[PDB]
Description:
Two copies of one chain form a homodimer.
Chain A: H1 2-16, H2 24-31, H3 35-41, H4 45-69, H5 76-92, H6 95-104, H7 109-135, H8 145-164, H9 173-189
Helix pairs in contact in A: 1-2, 1-4, 1-6, 4-5, 4-6, 4-7, 5-8, 5-9, 7-8, 8-9
One copy of the ligand CC(C)N1CCC2(CC1)CC(=O)c1cc(-c3ccc(C(=O)Nc4ccccc4)cc3)ccc1O2 binds next to helix 4, helix 5, helix 7 and helix 8 of chain B.
PDB class: dna binding protein
Keywords: helix-turn-helix, DNA binding protein, tetr-family, complex, inhibitor, drug design, tuberculosis, ethionamide
Assembly: dimeric
Amino acid sequence: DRELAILATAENLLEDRPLADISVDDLAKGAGISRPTFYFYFPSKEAVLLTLLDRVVNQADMALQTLAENPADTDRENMWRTGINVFFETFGSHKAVTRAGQAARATSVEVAELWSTFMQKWIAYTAAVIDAERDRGAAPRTLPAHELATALNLMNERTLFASFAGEQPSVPEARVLDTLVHIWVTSIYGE
Amino acid sequence: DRELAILATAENLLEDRPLADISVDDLAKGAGISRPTFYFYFPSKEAVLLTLLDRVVNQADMALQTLAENPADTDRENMWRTGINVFFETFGSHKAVTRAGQAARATSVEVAELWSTFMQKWIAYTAAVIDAERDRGAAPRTLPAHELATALNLMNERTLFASFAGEQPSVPEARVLDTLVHIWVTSIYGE
Ligand SMILES: CC(C)N1CCC2(CC1)CC(=O)c1cc(-c3ccc(C(=O)Nc4ccccc4)cc3)ccc1O2
Ligand SMILES: CC(C)N1CCC2(CC1)CC(=O)c1cc(-c3ccc(C(=O)Nc4ccccc4)cc3)ccc1O2
């Protein structure tokens, strides 16, 4: 629709500059509509970012659900690499939305709640897998699974997004998947 | 001085509310000085936060330097616990400054550079220790030490500060030290 066109313009302009430096008129111009027509589809540029971030987080969540239902037939290290990769490729395919959506957590309760909701889901799934590994005798009973899951997910959020943003310091993007897989596997399976 | 009094007032008020909700007049009132007298000691409330954060980061850095020069005579797990504890206790003793200083990274190049400088120092020290452990045969040669060091430091930044801020999700503050020690030890020593 014109909705899709607003969303594509916003994602395009966020590659060039921050949300603060993009106007409703910039989004309207880019989508080939007037400013009042824009305000019919979105109440604000902030709502546009919230919708883009919702699409990215849901894309990651659905990719992870697909993997859960379709396990790779490979060793445990490659199965964890496949799962972390869902987040590497999904957020890594949408760096501008990832960056702007992380920044908006400070100023938008809706953005903070969206992020919070999905982190709780991803941590709960990670914890359930660690517990199932322990129950089948493949992983030792060390830390409480939900606490370990929490720290590993927060590590991935900070480390992936620092790499994508080219922060100083950061792990090079071409090394971050291997880095995170090593820490997940050693901390889940290590005595 | 009146400087110290401004800094104590600012740290006090940041426990109640964000920097945006604290006025120069609030800091002046709290330190028993006029607004123009305030502007003699600091150009802005933002400079006050930058100075508070500099003091906290330097306190952590000097505590770590003290430990490096005065190793605990205990096993490797307790030596890493002692070192992570420097960051747990120092930032954990200054939660309001930690929280406001992390938020200011978005809006202050000076705050971003301060944080960046010290993270590079702490990562470099972590990497040098991992290399020395590998050289003495106590740790296996797995990931590049500087990349592993980077991810472990970014994990600690995100996980400690989420715990202190009571974010949802977060590791409980009473469990975060043990959580991080487990992940550091398994990822540094694990094959
Ligand atoms: C042990 C063996 C039997 N199998 C292991 C692999 C499976 C099934 C079981 C499937 C998988 O793909 C997976 C992924 C994550 C998972 C969850 C979250 C992240 C993650 O990166 N967060 C993240 C990233 C950015 C921001 C916030 C969170 C990564 C992997 C957690 C468990 C999994 O189980
Ligand atoms: C192996 C054995 C021989 N000894 C291990 C302990 C020692 C000496 C050697 C001393 C120590 O206390 C230490 C601490 C850190 C260290 C560095 C950074 C953090 C950290 O938490 N970041 C952090 C926190 C918040 C925000 C940003 C970074 C923790 C520990 C790194 C190496 C160390 O070596």
